């Protein structure tokens, strides 16, 4: 009978480890191991985009930390409402999707990477109820007509695309929804609402650096003394 | 006004990392920096429990490399159909998660490690559409009135509940639904259908052993020469 069609193996781990500073970041990476401590200074380096106090992503910050990290670039940046209609979640997540593509620039060819896209894009706006109380979600503006909350998100791209540079995408929604967050909590693909979404984000390309530190050091680092 | 909420910090990264060996398990880790190590050996030991031709998961050959682990214990196994009714996909889901606490064993407190469980419970008949060609499942016995599927997860969980051992729980579901591909695919939590669900599931304990041993070195172990 026919054999099974293989494919070059990845590990797909959903790692939630306690960490030494305050990370209010879903962080999804799609990198070689011994950049994986590039990676996550470069995550931990924008946290301090995102205001203590109101939980907000400021846009200003994000680009002082940008353009202060060192042997990199911005690729290119975002600020400004990308979804102001009534719509069906499963026709935003593509319009997002493709406002992503074209923020990121480098084109990445990888179905996995651009399925982590998709998924973590729908997670932004379904499943909430599985993620009350994390860090990355912060609601505000509640009514019985409108339910409001941030949603923090950072991508970091390294493979034989980005070739000698990795690629940071910290992205931070601003969604507004005209309903109630009972009824937000339990939200499909295929649910309609009147959506504000505001969508803060840039990319930053840095010049690849490998480390094969002690596992535990690299995560021993804080958000301090990084740009 | 009122000063945010604070909770103890946790990074929750999505980790898509290039493998050394074949990983056709959808892995979910919930440990320590230290521990890593030992969460990523014992999943690689039941990478051989998934037959490498029919990709199904073989529950006998599960305890036989289970009674091989160095410094270690069942906790509780179970073998079974556990959905066989027409079922809406979120009644589904608390029974499975109910079922996973039950084998399980070891009672943990943690609200991110049971929305990660309940997350992850979800994800097994839902949005399948952005798990297509991905290892952690394989299709078959495909028809206009039939979808068949095999669905490979890992639980890893270590923390101040676990004590002295860590947890890990290699699951596997046979799926079958009463309906065709192109609509299991866009499947939603609020979908119901004709299920029939086999469960293969072992809890096993292991003593805590830590490593601060070099990253890369981390993921260059194969899944050979662990038991």
């Given at each position: 009978c026919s054999a099974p069609i293989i494919r070059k193996p990845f590990k797909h781990i959903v790692l939630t480890v306690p960490s030494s500073d305050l990370d209010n970041f879903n962080t999804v990476f799609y990198v070689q191991p011994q950049y994986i401590n590039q990676a996550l200074h470069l995550a931990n380096a924008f946290q301090?985009?995102?205001?203590?106090?109101?939980?907000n992503f400021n846009f200003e910050k994000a680009l002082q930390i940008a353009n202060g990290i060192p042997n990199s670039a911005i690729v290119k940046t975002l600020n400004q409402s990308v979804i102001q209609q009534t719509v069906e979640i499963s026709v935003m997540v593509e319009q997002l999707k493709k406002i992503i593509q074209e923020v990121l620039g480098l084109v990445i060819n990888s179905t996995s990477f651009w399925n982590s896209v998709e998924a973590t894009i729908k997670g932004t706006f379904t499943n909430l109820d599985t993620q009350?109380?994390?860090?990355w979600i912060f609601w505000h503006s509640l009514s019985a007509h409108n339910t409001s909350y941030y949603y923090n998100i950072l991508f970091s791209i390294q493979n034989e695309d980005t070739g000698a540079v990795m690629a940071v995408l910290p992205l931070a929604f601003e969604v507004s929804v005209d309903v109630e967050k009972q009824k937000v909590l339990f939200f499909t693909i295929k649910d309609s609402a009147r959506y504000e979404v505001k969508m803060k984000a840039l990319t930053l390309v840095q010049a690849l650096h490998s480390s094969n530190a002690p596992i535990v050091d690299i995560f021993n680092v804080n958000n301090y003394n990084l740009y």
């Open positions: 301090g985009a995102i205001d203590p106090l109101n939980l009350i109380d994390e860090a």
